């Protein structure tokens, strides 16, 4: 709780706000935690308990009225946010979690997810702090870090984040002279012959070459590191087989020699049973050579 | 109320699900709003009555046992929505928006600010209907849509919309061999001199090796089209001013017109006089011969 997620920003404070004048605004939405004002300037942060309070208090504190200035409470950016690519289809937003948290402590920790559900091999670790972000940072750009079993490593850069509520509005964009001579032609669909038309096929072109050109290097450089990623994954799986063919053979040997030394045992075992068949026949002999001195001896 | 923001996104679901089925799990959830079920892959998009009653609809029914199969609702991504880059710096949110209802109806629109609120050159468009966005795509397929008096194309890219709030948590995590094999070494910091320090630390020369080949193909692409602008705004300038030569010329032979049949007329008014000074002359000639003749004349009888 109490995230950065939840940070908020207010403008076009009073010059004459005070800490605890700042603090009641928000009161009527939970309990505020971390505050910083800088009343000179006349801009204030303000951490909530949830990013739910938070979209309450924008809602309802925006452009309100406050001795005369008219306030702009925005949503704060995430200063302690970072961008992570390289990682395996295996890899979870709980075990990314696990893995940064030796920097510095984790708010949160998300790996993005395509529409059918697979994952993209991007993640976003956000910290409670910006120095643990910036530790996080200097130890995987010099040095190498990784999640799992196989040795594919971890990029960590700076999380780009783009604006999707304040953009460029009218009211603070004509300010320039230009405007005039650029905001002079209405929007319009272009048509075929004129000088301007020609721009709008040739500039087009250099695009879609771009366009490719980037995409031929993207494909070009996919390959040479599959290249190193397929050279691992397996020829390091025969390393494996190797170890495990060694215990097959091993294991065949001791099979193998009890097959020809105790089968012997058994093969000596019907020699006796060969030369007690022998012993009676011989017992009948002497019987009967006996018999034919008693017929003799009588 | 009731737009693509408050939106939710449904996935998962199993054989079952049917019309009457699907409205009364949102029939709690105040009134149900725009109702469209798919039977064949099992997905759709139903509007909430505000955003902030979206967000409890959205975290009480994911992850919920329902007939096998685990609800997905996570924020329902914007569909239709539509990335448009090359913009000029003089582009404003209420321009763009007034520029790209032309095709359809528009939802929201945004120009990207940078660090120092100035434009970037690129901005977001939120179309409202499917058919309008492949339409409005249509448009700068085949042709072109200007936006300023520069000549600027506004280059109109497909948005991605990926699942950054959900993601991929162990509770609903598949099980297959390698899931669990890999699993079985903690995440580690490689040591120097080891094979696995040494095959990741050439594969991060590979990325160094990727940056490098995209910086550079960034800037040598950016410099062709920047000495594309030169070509036809520098012949723009000696054509304006080639074009402004014609009317002057004609303006120049205008009085040059004007001149000569002013002398051809002052040429005239002298011409004029000249024969008059012809005819009056030869008069007092032609009165003075008359006149000795017949003094001559009456000499002899």
Redo the contacts between chains.
């Keep these: 709780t109490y995230t950065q997620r939840c940070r908020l920003f207010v403008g076009n404070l009073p010059a004459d706000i005070t800490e605890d004048e700042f603090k009641r605004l928000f009161a009527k939405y939970g309990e505020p935690g971390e505050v910083f004002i800088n009343k000179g300037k006349g801009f204030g942060f303000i951490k909530l308990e949830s990013r ?1 309070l938070a ?2 208090a924008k ?1 309802e504190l925006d452009d309100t009225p406050m001795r005369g200035r008219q306030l702009r409470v925005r949503f704060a950016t995430h200063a302690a946010a970072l961008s992570v690519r ?1 990682l ?1 289809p ?6 990314l979690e ?2 940064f948290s ?1 920097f510095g402590p984790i708010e949160r920790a ?6 059918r ?1 697979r ?2 091999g991007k993640g ?1 670790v956000e910290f409670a702090s910006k120095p643990a972000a910036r530790k996080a940072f200097e ?1 995987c750009s010099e ?11 971890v ?1 960590v850069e700076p999380l780009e984040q ?9 009211k603070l ?2 300010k ?1 002279p ?2 005039q ?5 209405p ?4 048509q075929h012959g004129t ?10 072109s ?2 879609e ?2 366009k490719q ?2 995409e031929q ?1 993207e494909k ?2 996919k390959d ?2 599959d290249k ?2 397929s050279e ?1 994954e397996d020829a390091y799986h025969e390393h494996q087989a190797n170890l495990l063919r060694q215990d097959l053979m091993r294991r065949q040997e001791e099979l193998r020699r009890m097959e020809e030394l105790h089968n012997q045992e058994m093969q000596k075992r019907k020699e006796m049973q060969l030369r007690q068949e022998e012993e009676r026949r011989r017992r009948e002999e002497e019987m009967m050579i006996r018999q034919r001195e008693m017929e003799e001896q009588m």
Excluded: C, H
């Design positions: 739910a979209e309450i809602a390289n395996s295996y890899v979870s937003n709980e075990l696990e893995a030796q998300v790996v993005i997810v395509d529409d559900g994952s993209t976003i130890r040095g190498v870090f990784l999640l799992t079993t196989t040795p594919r490593p990029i783009l604006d999707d509520e304040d953009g460029l509005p009218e964009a004509q320039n230009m405007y001579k650029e905001r002079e032609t929007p319009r669909f272009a000088f301007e038309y020609e721009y709008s096929q040739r500039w087009k250099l695009d070459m771009e050109q980037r290097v070009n450089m040479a590191k190193l990623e691992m």
